[PDB]
């Protein structure tokens, strides 16, 4: 019991210093042991998701709702008193798990406490009114989102767009300091002018030049002086080439920079707090013997609670992986590398096919033949030709048929002659290959995924289900296997795959902006735009809704901008998308603050400041990951091969059956001596293989001032550990 | 008559090293090097420039032209034989340069020729006939911009677009196949549609979802279809969202990767062409004597011819600048750095003032105590307060009396009362510092230049001149001085006021593009919008010009955008720059092809491509160049100190005596005989100062790898000198 409270210690040791949390873990007792493995399974990551998406998903419940979901009062109020009474739960197991001054030290937790009050109050508010109130605190509502586990990319990508905000704020007070004196002398020029309300008044002329700022008014601002004077196209021109020419370019440029600097620092600072980690690992493994090192039984332990699912030969070919000299024990310099070691998955070295042990003769050849001529170039160099062919049939059928070729109800013997040549090869392919190893390649999971939506084309063209049809319409996509010919595209879509999960988180904290940008526009601008409305505004045109019921048939004229609501959350999130895209947002802007204040301007400027930020700083990561990897590929997974004898083998089995382990290991080592009695061989040459990540990538990059930093952390170890 | 035509030679060895062209100087006879000098004299750069600006501003006067320029056929069809005449003066004295076969292996002066030929030939018909041709030959006309010396950097900049367009071109491939595959969904989907003319068609759907591709029209495409089903949101987000989110980004990065490449490989070759000449010239000056070097007087040669305007004295100091070594003669390492220590100034160590010399007492102790004041830091601080007070004055002012501050013809006393203290502190700060230690500095030259308009100003406010009053309507440019206490505007402020000359020359080919579209659509496009036209197409409502007569006083209705004609030169570059910002670019579009055909869609379908690129260069450029120097700042002008003798300054005395050079070098040496013997002294300590540019800074960062380059260039002229 005293081994495996170590163990399990010092996995927590490893476990840590992954996540970019600082070390707490140390225990006083095993209680706080237990809440560790408490807090830290599976399970409670998955509730505190599911509890968040579901106070977030009942939003759209609510006052302002949906019509068909629109729940009485007391039944959203009590679910809101549910959910919050299990958040409280996660709350007080975390409270178990630290102290009390480290509960409260801690920042996030007290800002998620915080938010918990007040939501829990107002929701009994709720209760008892049975009237809903303003509401404004469900903006909030977003930290219960990203304060989980499973989105902690959410939270590492919103601190480092916060990080970066102070170049980008100085840049925009210089941009607002050119705009506010090009305000002032366009209204010196332009307010004698009975033409025109661009320039009525010196704030409605802030405002216009302000949206001149972000193109979305152009010509439309320019044209009531150029119609007077033409030497006022000056104006515009030398204003619009200061700022979209100089400044915003500047601005993208300064945002760059900086977003450089916070990767470097990310990651060394996560290089020297792994190697704190490891050193306190091999410090609970300490020896009190005349070597030192680490026995072999310790490193069970360690890969027995750390990577719970690696089996016993796997542990051994780590053992040895490590080792790199003549000893029984380890190192620390053999030790430092134990990240980057255990990630990988071992094989033995067999040469079969997944489809020819069973086989006899007189099909044997048949399926062996099958796997010689798919290996084959010239039969992949038919089926580009069969690709093309394809092609020009689609382009040719289309400037014959006149575009009509879409609309019918009969497919003209195109698409099923194709999708039966690419289905016939393309389980010929899967099974001359076999199954793992075609999957394992891009293209070809690509291939398989759209000739299973064209068999459904096939269930919609002779069936009486009509509206799948669309998948028929959706021949060309069977061209986009030919762009694997050339090589810019292998690369750059290799990147493109690559850089796939960030993007995503950032388009998930991009969906926080909106969703509390929602909510506050959701009170405060109810009802406030209806058809026909805004007629005494300037964007009036916009907003209209004509019968003309001449003839009987009343063909209607309407501008159809009265349908960005603020209504519920789907049209809200409608609304705000077609905000962050900026063409034609002063509409709607207009309208609004014709219907509410001279205020509600501040809202979408700051909309649009916001969403500035956010786009800038996407453009900003995808140019440094692209630069970054073709920097790498232009300086020069991995497969390591090792062996262990037979005697090591055995020694090793006499160790696992005297510590009585699961039948497992036992008879997967008796697997092993049942291979080395197949092939009557002495020693097992294994590989392992491993996917090259960006951790790996920077270390062969940065690896000419990594020792410094090494050292230098070294002696701050030594300064701050005779304290 | 020896030495000098070798020194000649040597020194055009010099000047061919920065210019990058081959070497062709090598002369069998002296009239080459009389041609030479004939066709670099700075005189002809000027009339060659001259004339290409006349040949383009002659084109103002053509058949569409301004109305009050409209000359007679005969008078331009004259002028264009007499400037194209002159043309020709030009090619014949560079043939005269040349031999005859390099100057038709030489592509640009071919390419010159040829269009020379078709203008010639065209002009000599429109003479004939008196009446202009279809005539768009004049699109050709920018190579001779293109091909003066002043606009090398326009051409090395065009060059630059042009070797990293296929990078551009293939995405710009993958970016098109997804918006025909969503064109052709989208007609299936929305054709069955009687209420929108968006997808009536499938060639009008192609055409609606390019423009949806550059932000164009966004809601006003989407809303008929998300009037009917609420669900059609989905297709205009995801196609939305795959390309302005990966397939745009995705072409700044390959843009950007491919420029960084480019710029290393320009720096590599402009060093190993520096490289061979100067090894040409050390050949040149080849001794025949025991030593390996070159004599003082062979250096005399360089610096006579090379660089004319340097004095004796600071020949001598580059001399011993060069030497870095104790002896008679120079080296090839001592010497392979002429270019980087030519280029500076030399001056002695005085430490007087510029306005003291003449003064007497009871006035020196007045100007030296203002020497000392204003180098003081509490004045400095106190001038910030000065301008912080000015500030809040205009801002207070502003919202006391509503904005109406500027339309009085009377001054509120502010810009009296802060004139005159800038002013005074502007002449008090220049007394006391001198001219040209004041005008060294950046912000000082500014606050002179502002305050220098500001008194037009008083001139326009006292007296008869109205249209000055705009001086006094741009009173807040003086807060601009107080950006300079925070450190980053400093160092951004620093790059724009450095990266500003290349950002002129791609404006320049910016302006090249567009007078090239500006001809090609003047022709064609020349009456064809006109006041309520195009009432038929589907953007009528912007063309309308309606007049309301009731009350006799006829209020106006106008849509405007009438105005963007294709008449003459102006009203094109200002329909041109309308298309470059890209906002409601498909409403001219969409008029013009109402009035010509279906197949000018593609003349600006076309202008958007060639934008896109011009601009996504521009924004490469800005973000290298301030990476660049933000990595220099962060790894880490030029001053050197050097002395000579008393007695080796007497023995180049008697040797400049010898040579009997001008009265200027002699009494130049005795005003240094005279400094000698005020100050009483033996050593003349000297300083030479040089402003640090890219070339040096690139030299500090590609240290690294630079000796491999040396090293293989040298094997690489052995395996090219053996043969
Ligand atoms: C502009 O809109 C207002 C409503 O905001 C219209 O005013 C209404 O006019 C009708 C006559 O058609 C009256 O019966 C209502 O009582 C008015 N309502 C209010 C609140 O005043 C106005 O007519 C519209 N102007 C137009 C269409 O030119
Ligand atoms: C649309 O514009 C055309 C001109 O392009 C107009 O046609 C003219 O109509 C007037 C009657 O007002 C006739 O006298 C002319 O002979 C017509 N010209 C041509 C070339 O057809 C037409 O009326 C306009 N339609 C509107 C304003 O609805
Ligand atoms: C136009 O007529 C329809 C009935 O066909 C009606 O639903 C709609 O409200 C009318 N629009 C008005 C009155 O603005
Ligand atoms: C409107 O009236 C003016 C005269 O005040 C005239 O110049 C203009 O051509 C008229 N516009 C028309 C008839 O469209
Ligand atoms: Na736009
Ligand atoms: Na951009």
New interface residues.
Partial sequence: HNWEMNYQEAAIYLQEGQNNDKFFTHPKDARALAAYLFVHNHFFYMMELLTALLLLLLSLCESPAVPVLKLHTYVHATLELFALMVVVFELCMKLRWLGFHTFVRHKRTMVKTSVLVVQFIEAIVVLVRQTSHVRVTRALRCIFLVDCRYCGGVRRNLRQIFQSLP?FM??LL?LL?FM??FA??G???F?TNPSDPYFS???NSIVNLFVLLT??????V???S??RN?WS?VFF?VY?SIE???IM??L???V??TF?DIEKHKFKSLLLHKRTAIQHAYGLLASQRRPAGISYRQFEGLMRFYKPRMSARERFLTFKALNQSNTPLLSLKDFYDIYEVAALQWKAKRNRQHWFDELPRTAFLIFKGINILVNSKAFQYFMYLVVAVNGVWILVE?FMLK?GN??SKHVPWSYLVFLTIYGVELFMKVAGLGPVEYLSSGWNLFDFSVTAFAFLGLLALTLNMEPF??IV?????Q??RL?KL?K??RN?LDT?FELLPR?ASLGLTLLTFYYSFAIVGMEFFNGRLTPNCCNTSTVADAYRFINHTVGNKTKVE?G??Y??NFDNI?NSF?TL??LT????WYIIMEGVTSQTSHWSRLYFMTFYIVTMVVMTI??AF??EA??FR?NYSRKSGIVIEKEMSKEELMAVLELYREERGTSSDVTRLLDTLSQMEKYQQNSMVFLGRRSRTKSDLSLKMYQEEIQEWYEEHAREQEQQKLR
């Fill in positions: 170049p100085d840049i210089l300091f506010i004196i002032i002398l209204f010196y020029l307010s008044t010196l704030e193109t979305a008014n152009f010509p439309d320019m044209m009531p150029y119609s033409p196209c021109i619009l979209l020419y100089f370019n500047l993208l440029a300064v760059f920079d450089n289309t575009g879409f609309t049809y669309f319409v959706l021949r060309p996509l061209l986009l762009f050339k810019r595209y750059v493109m993007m309407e159809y901008y349908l960005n789907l409608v998308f077609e895209v900026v063409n034609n996407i453009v995808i140019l692209f630069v073709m």
